[PDB]
Structure 1
């Protein structure tokens, strides 16, 4: 619910740990339109546990949404935000 979002080339990075992650609020979010998870079941997040979680927030174009995916190619992917091939996590995107 941050009022201001960082740029794609300067994507805001936050670390979250030592707390309980509630995904019910994330599910209840209405304007979400692009929810893709790789390596883990999205419905099993409430049960699976991890060490730490990293949140990277930015703003891109509508057609650039598909660029944010492992193994993808593009200007945003190559020179703005690159994901590992073995990425095990989720990506959420909503209109602004």
Structure 2
């Protein structure tokens, strides 16, 4: 979607693994504020949005 109508999708109630994301997209920038990605594979969250 375009910026002025960004799209939001709720993802919950599932086992999330953030190790598969390295695949898709050369990923010019992948950075986090408040967590560090190598440790991101461990914690449990409230409600993650995309």
TM-score (norm 1): 0.47
Provide structure 2 residue ranges, at least 5 long, that are not aligned to the other structure. Answer: none
Which structure dedicates a bigger proportion of its chain to strand? 1
CA deviation after TM superposition for structure 1 residue 24, in Å: 1.8
CA deviation after TM superposition for structure 1 residue 11, in Å: 0.6
2:40 aligned partner? 45
CA deviation after TM superposition for structure 1 residue 28, in Å: 2.4
Which consecutive segments of 4 or more residues in structure 1 shift more than 4 A? none
**CA RMSD across the alignment:** 2.8
* Residues 8 and 30 (structure 1), Cα distance of their counterparts in 2 relative to 1, 3 Å cut: closer
Instruction: Give the count of matched residue pairs.
Output: 50
CA deviation after TM superposition for structure 1 residue 12, in Å: 0.9
Structure ID, larger Rg: 1
CA deviation after TM superposition for structure 1 residue 29, in Å: 2.7
TM-score (norm 2): 0.83
* Residues 30 and 8 (structure 1), Cα distance of their counterparts in 2 relative to 1, 3 Å cut: closer
